[PDB]
Design a protein around this motif. Structure first.
Motif, mmCIF file in Angstrom:
data_model
loop_
_atom_site.group_PDB
_atom_site.id
_atom_site.type_symbol
_atom_site.label_atom_id
_atom_site.label_comp_id
_atom_site.label_asym_id
_atom_site.label_seq_id
_atom_site.Cartn_x
_atom_site.Cartn_y
_atom_site.Cartn_z
ATOM 1 N N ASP A 52 0.842 -1.194 0.000
ATOM 2 C CA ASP A 52 0.000 0.000 0.000
ATOM 3 C C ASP A 52 0.880 1.248 0.000
ATOM 4 O O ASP A 52 1.525 1.554 1.001
ATOM 5 N N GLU A 53 0.899 1.966 -1.120
ATOM 6 C CA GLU A 53 1.715 3.172 -1.253
ATOM 7 C C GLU A 53 1.095 4.413 -0.598
ATOM 8 O O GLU A 53 1.124 5.504 -1.169
ATOM 9 N N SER A 54 0.546 4.244 0.603
ATOM 10 C CA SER A 54 -0.070 5.349 1.337
ATOM 11 C C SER A 54 -0.432 4.927 2.756
ATOM 12 O O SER A 54 -0.981 5.717 3.525
ATOM 13 N N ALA A 55 -0.115 3.679 3.089
ATOM 14 C CA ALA A 55 -0.401 3.103 4.400
ATOM 15 C C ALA A 55 -0.370 4.083 5.575
ATOM 16 O O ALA A 55 -1.305 4.858 5.777
ATOM 17 N N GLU A 56 0.703 4.040 6.356
ATOM 18 C CA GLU A 56 0.832 4.913 7.519
ATOM 19 C C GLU A 56 1.414 6.274 7.150
ATOM 20 O O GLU A 56 0.685 7.257 7.018
ATOM 21 N N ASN A 57 2.732 6.322 6.993
ATOM 22 C CA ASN A 57 3.428 7.550 6.635
ATOM 23 C C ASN A 57 4.292 7.278 5.414
ATOM 24 O O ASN A 57 5.256 7.995 5.151
#
Ligand SMILES: CN1C(=O)CN=C(c2ccccc2)c2cc(Cl)ccc21
Length: 578
Positions: A52-57
């Motif tokens: 996931d290219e937007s997960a957490e930070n």
């Protein structure tokens, strides 16, 4: 996401190592375990970002990510005092803080190595923790080590054990390869320290000139426009590694090796053997490739740089490019000069144009500019001749001593350890370079010397005690060697007063290796000279001869290492007499 970017390009392996290096280089005093933990945590996070290219930070810059992770242990001022302050800052500031706190001389306990039996076992049992440990130890003691190159050394380190541990006489097969590596690693570290120094203190225009000249020598056939491309990249590479951005530096470096290999025919003919090997070796290889043969028919320099009449014109149009050209042209045909000599002639030329072009008759004023080069060229050639002649008589040890004396009279304030360290290296120049034919001596000699002087410079900058050292180090990167050679004996230095503690005499010296024996014996000589700047070689030798009799006797004496106490005070008496 950036972390993901670097992950895919480098892969699990190298990504893991690079980050370990980076962390060890930022928090040199922090233990292995913790680092490993943080590295792993950090790596886990990356794994999710790939998905996931937007997960957490995952949208963050490496600085913020790397910065926060360390700050989960740096805030512990009791352990890393001056570090906490760094974590209370923001980005990009929070990093500069970190870069500004690297120690070039960490207070880390010597690194002794267990018998060959324990290493092989530890190696065989766990092959991952054994290498991770290796990187950690090197990177923490060499906070400017060229990361990508460290992975190279690592591969060779493993190959050492992987081989010697299945031998017949492990120690026999191991010991050698490991020494050869500890040396090669120290050199590499110095070489790179200079590079970071140049960039850091003198600017990129300065790092550039150096590369232009250096590459142009290596690649005579290459064309100015091509080199410039290489120089532009190279700079970014090193600009990154030195600034702490290892991952991207690791990446970019590869891209540069890829390219240079694609365009082989346009660059060098000696690159073949380099491009046919694994990535890491390919890179290391290219960086150490011998210069290419010199293009057959080459016009003279005088033609376009002194005789032409459009000189001042071209100079005013794009002096940067025109001078970049002059340097590239002078270098290619002169692989017998040192990079610094070259940059030196270059700077002379520039200065000339600057005054001449603003005159009533340019071509008349700058007409005999090659006349001025003559001195600048013969100087090093002569000094190199002398010094090798000497070295050829005295041998390495006695040559180091001569040099040790000389520099101490030059900068007495400088701390005994540094002067002992620096002067020891300054002498290797002799053994390393003197055995070459004139044609290859100067680059070997003067550029190596530039490294050894950079050391003294950096070590000194920590705790500046001599302004004469400061002037020479900050006044001109290119002129350091001459600046230091100008120095005679400091006429304002007031000698120190002896003390029992000034030097201790514990008998513990009879157990040390042959080397560490000369080293104490040299640390003395320095110490003497600081007390009697005014002694010449006659009393020093005499006294030094004596200091020898002291260790031999008292070490070989049957008494409970006390002759050390009594005879210790006995010599001090004799010494003061001289
Ligand atoms: C450390 N060092 C000196 O201080 C004297 N100057 C030089 C030198 C002079 C000009 C260019 C390069 C080097 C030199 C030459 C040798 Cl071959 C060994 C040690 C040494």
């Amino acid at each position: 996401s950036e972390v993901a970017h670097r992950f895919k390009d480098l892969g699990e392996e190298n990504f893991k190592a690079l980050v370990l290096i980076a962390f060890a280089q930022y928090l040199q005093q922090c233990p292995f375990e913790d680092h490993v933990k943080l590295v792993n945590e950090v790596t886990e996070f990356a794994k999710t970002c790939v998905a996931d290219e937007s997960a957490e930070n995952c949208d963050k810059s490496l600085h913020t990510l790397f910065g926060d992770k360390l700050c989960t242990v740096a805030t512990l001022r009791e352990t890393y005092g001056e570090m906490a302050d760094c974590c209370a800052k923001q980005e990009p500031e929070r990093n500069e803080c970190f870069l500004q706190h690297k120690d070039d001389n960490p207070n880390l306990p010597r690194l002794v190595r267990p018998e060959v039996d324990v290493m092989c076992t530890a190696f065989h049992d766990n092959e991952e923790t054994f290498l991770k440990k290796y990187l950690y130890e090197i990177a923490r003691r060499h906070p400017y080590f060229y990361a990508p190159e460290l992975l190279f050394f690592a591969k060779r380190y493993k190959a050492a054990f992987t081989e010697c541990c299945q031998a017949a006489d492990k120690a026999a097969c191991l010991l050698p390869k490991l020494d050869e590596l500890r040396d090669e690693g120290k050199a590499s570290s110095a070489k790179q320290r200079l590079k970071c120094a140049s960039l850091q203190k003198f600017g990129e225009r300065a790092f550039k000139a150096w590369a232009v000249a250096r590459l142009s020598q290596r690649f005579p056939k290459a064309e100015f426009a091509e080199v410039s491309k290489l120089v532009t990249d190279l700079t970014k590479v090193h600009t990154e590694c030195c600034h702490g951005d290892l991952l991207e530096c690791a990446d970019d470096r590869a891209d540069l090796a890829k390219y240079i290999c694609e365009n082989q025919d346009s660059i060098s003919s000696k690159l073949k053997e380099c491009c046919e090997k694994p990535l890491l070796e390919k890179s290391h290889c290219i960086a150490e490739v011998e210069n290419d043969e010199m293009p057959a028919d080459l016009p003279s320099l005088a033609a376009d740089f002194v005789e032409s009449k459009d000189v001042c014109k071209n100079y005013a149009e794009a002096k940067d490019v025109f001078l970049g050209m002059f340097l590239y042209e002078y270098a290619r045909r002169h692989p017998d000069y040192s990079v610094v000599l070259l940059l030196r002639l270059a700077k002379t030329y520039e200065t000339t144009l600057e005054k001449c072009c603003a005159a009533a008759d340019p071509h008349e004023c700058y007409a005999k500019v090659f006349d001025e080069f003559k001195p600048l060229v013969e100087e090093p050639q002569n000094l190199i001749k002398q010094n090798c002649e000497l070295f050829e008589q005295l041998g390495e040890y006695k040559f180091q001593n001569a040099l040790l004396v000389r520099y101490t009279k030059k900068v007495p304030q400088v701390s005994t350890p540094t002067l002992v360290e620096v002067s020891r290296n300054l002498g290797k120049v002799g053994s390393k370079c003197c055995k070459h034919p004139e044609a290859k001596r100067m680059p070997c000699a003067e550029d190596y010397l530039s490294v050894v002087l950079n050391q003294l410079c950096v070590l000194h900058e920590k705790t500046p005690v001599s302004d004469r050292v400061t002037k020479c180090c900050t006044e001109s990167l290119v002129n350091r060697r001459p600046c230091f050679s100008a120095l005679e004996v400091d006429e304002t230095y007031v000698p120190k007063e002896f003390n029992a503690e000034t030097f201790t005499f514990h008998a513990d010296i009879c157990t040390l290796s042959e080397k560490e024996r000369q080293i104490k014996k040299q640390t003395a000589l320095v110490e003497l000279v600081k007390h009697k700047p005014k002694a010449t070689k006659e009393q020093l030798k005499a006294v030094m001869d004596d200091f020898a009799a002291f260790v031999e006797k008292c070490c070989k004496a049957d008494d409970k290492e006390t002759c050390f106490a009594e005879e210790g005070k006995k010599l001090v008496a004799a010494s003061q007499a001289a």
